[PDB]
């Protein structure tokens with residue numbers, strides 16, 4: 456598998472690029488320039504349902520980000536291709552991004568970009584070691600990543616008394632202690648990975664972001680399938696018991712996408728499932 | 732029905748506001764501040780599926796913007812409430828917009844805003860426009876898409892390729908031509924709709940704010956599915972230089988003698 460999915464420590468910066476396929480005839484030259492550069496460590500690759508649909512190929516486990524008909528909003532903004540750049544120098548990532556964007560034209564056009572950088576403790580409780588591989592990597596070495604750009608209203612959240620803030624997350628801000636008497640709407644009670652009848656463990660690799668769209672969390676959930684993320688999101692959205700996650704009171708996702716992260720061979724990224 | 736849906740000529744400016752429901756507990760007071768101001772002419776109202784879901788009510792004909800699993804991208808960014816301001820003075824519309832945004836606060840947060848400014852020979856007119864866009868109860872069902880075009884790429888193609896993408900009329904144009912994909916008479920239940928689109932330009936780019944109003948969503952949806960290649964594998968040429976950034980379905984409620992009629996939703 457692409458080692459960057461689980462490899463730690465996470466670099467301080469990331470650039471997420473999302474592309475729309477606008478000229479399918481030019482796709483081979485774009486892939487010829489892109490794929491030798493995908494090492495699964497500083498450059499990771501994800502494939503969206505539209506690209507598989509455009510090639511008449513059905514990738515097992517790959518589907519668009521779903522449509523949840525709920526009382527909260529989880530938009531589906533599925534794109535064809537996802538590039539995940541990782542590094543410690545922000546300026547170097549931007550120049551690498553620009554070269555990759557131009558390398559993918561005219562086949563692809565840039566549809567979205569998120570610049571991630573590394574007040575609760577998001578991303579703990581992630582599976583570790585062999586359990587992280589089991590949770591995030593399918594048998595063939597593929598992974599299935601859900602991406603949501605969440606926008607926060609910290610003015611409203613920090614205006615609440617600390618007791619209500621902790622009731623929304625489900626843990627104390629002072630020492631990150633779990634609250635057993637927290638309401639069922641508390642976030643960690645909605646996403647309790649052990650609380651789903653088929654356990655819903657996933658590996659989260661989120662980053663902070665801030666641009667003209669606001670500020671918040673670039674949420675990334677990697678699993679051996681999309682099922683873990685989707686059952687969790689459906690419960691958060693009130694589709695299981697009518698109880699909505701408290702997160703939606705001060706935060707909302709602006710984007711939503713499903714991407715198949717192909718396996719690595721010993722010599723590079725393996726797209727044989729998609730290409731002949 | 733809300734008369735602004737069909738009244739023509741279209742004023743030079745429109746402000747589309749879209750809201751997300753973040754505090755349902757504050758919804759009754761927010762609606763009490765909004766509804767007396769909705770006249771269906773200079774301020775029109777649309778209701779999204781999330782708002783009905785939050786109230787536990789099923790509005791007949793109302794559903795979220797669909798998820799099209801196609802080789803082109805039509806995102807679903809469904810919001811709870813849509814305000815459609817119409818007028819000739821841009822500054823007056825923005826001043827009204829701010830007042831409405833603040834009136835809906837606590838309950839709603841602003842999720843999206845589109846500043847619209849102004850062939851249509853096949854758009855329904857007169858009684859045919861009423862028939863196409865207005866349901867029996869006076870409701871309408873509006874599909875909204877914020878399309879972003881790359882006219883630099885479109886005008887770089889030879890003029891013949893430009894004309895084959897739109898279809899103009901060109902009888903020998905390929906089936907992928909836009910006017911051949913959207914021929915309202917070419918759908919087995921004819922797919923006539925009333926279009927009320929406007930141009931836009933902001934930090935997201937520039938293009939067309941597409942608005943399709945029908946007595947149900949069926950006309951828009953079968954057309955979009957054909958445009959996306961889901962009907963016969965042939966994709967509309969529009970997608971070669973343009974793509975929608977947003978997507979939403981909204982139920983435009985009827986008007987009573989005294990104002991907008993939300994009894995189906997609030998009872």
Ligand code: HEM
Pocket residue numbers: 575576577578579580581603605606624626642643646647648649671672674676683684687688702706707
């Ligand atoms: C604005 C977006 C989000 C923020 C700020 C956020 C923040 C947090 C925080 C503070 C915790 C508690 C500490 C931890 O275990 O990480 C947590 C836990 C968790 N979150 Fe989120 N989260 C967000 C969205 C999501 C979403 C959309 C999912 C969907 C699957 C998710 C899944 C989880 C899981 C699985 C846990 C661990 C639960 C367990 O203990 O088993 N998070 N998150």
Ligand code: HEM
Pocket residue numbers: 850851852853854876878879880897909910911912913914915938939941943951954955969973974
């Ligand atoms: C970037 C977005 C769009 C642009 C720039 C655009 C432009 C055009 C143009 C140039 C025409 C030919 C002249 C005319 O009859 O109006 C046309 C026709 C038409 N388009 Fe679009 N269009 C867009 C999106 C859509 C969408 C999304 C739909 C339906 C879901 C649609 C439905 C129609 C219909 C019904 C006609 C009537 C003429 C015919 O089909 O023969 N348009 N449009």
Ligand SMILES: [Cl-]
Pocket residue numbers: 482483486730
């Ligand atoms: Cl290819």
Ligand SMILES: [Cl-]
Pocket residue numbers: none
């Ligand atoms: Cl091996």
Ligand SMILES: [Cl-]
Pocket residue numbers: 564879880881972973974
């Ligand atoms: Cl574009």
Ligand SMILES: [Cl-]
Pocket residue numbers: 905906907965
């Ligand atoms: Cl064709």
